[PDB]
Every structure is written in C-alpha cells, then in structure tokens.
Amino acid sequence: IPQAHEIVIPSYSKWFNLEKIHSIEVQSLPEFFTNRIPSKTP
Amino acid sequence: XXXXXGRXXXXXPXXXXTXXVTXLXXXXXRXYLRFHXXXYXXXXXXX
C-alpha cells in the first residue's frame, strides 16, 4: 500500500542495517562509544 | 482535506542492491651583511 522507492548501495555496504550498530562503525567512529561522555551515546 | 484531527498535514504535494524505501518517510520497507660588526676591521688595519 505505501508508495515505493528504489535506491542503490555498493555491494560492500550490505553490512549496514538500521536498528543495529556494526563493529565497523564502532571502530571507525570511536567517540560515540567511550562511556565517559553523557551526550555522545550510541 | 487531508488534515486529520487538528493536524495541518494539508501543505503536501498531492498528484549493487535495489532496496525499497517508503515514500513520505524514507525507511527500508633581502639584506646581506656589510663589513662592520662582522668581526673584521675590528682586529686589523696595520696602517
């Protein structure tokens, strides 16, 4: 029933999924995961 | 027309991997020194 789109992703980016955090993100953007800062939360 | 229960939703336009996304909410469906002060003619000149 809802309208559809179509988008394209490089094949090496299939690991990306919403509702989920991957280890690539944790080791690429380390700021949001050091448990010292209250604002920068996952 | 499209406003629902006090919400003004009226001002809206009405008319590799291929993931599908929901419309209306996208989600997956110089100077050189001179001689002085350079330490000669300050120890010199036998004339």
Curated annotation (Swiss-Prot), chain A:
Localisation: Nucleus
Function recorded in the entry: Involved in transcriptional activation. Component of the SWI/SNF complex, an ATP-dependent chromatin-remodeling complex, which is required for the positive and negative regulation of gene expression of a large number of genes. It changes chromatin structure by altering DNA-histone contacts within a nucleosome, leading eventually to a change in nucleosome position, thus facilitating or repressing binding of gene-specific transcription factors.
Subunit structure: Interacts with RTT102, SWP82 and the N-terminus of SNF2. Component of the SWI/SNF global transcription activator complex. The 1.14 MDa SWI/SNF complex is composed of 11 different subunits: one copy each of SWI1, SNF2/SWI2, SNF5, SNF12/SWP73, ARP7/SWP61, ARP9/SWP59; two copies each of SWI3, SNF6, SNF11, SWP82; and three copies of TAF14/SWP29.
Misc note: Present with 3150 molecules/cell in log phase SD medium.
Protein name from the UniProt record: SWI/SNF complex subunit SWI3
Source organism of the structure: Saccharomyces cerevisiae (strain ATCC 204508 / S288c) (Baker's yeast)
Lineage start: Eukaryota, Fungi, Dikarya, Ascomycota, Saccharomycotina
Interval of the full protein contained in this chain: 299 to 340 of 825
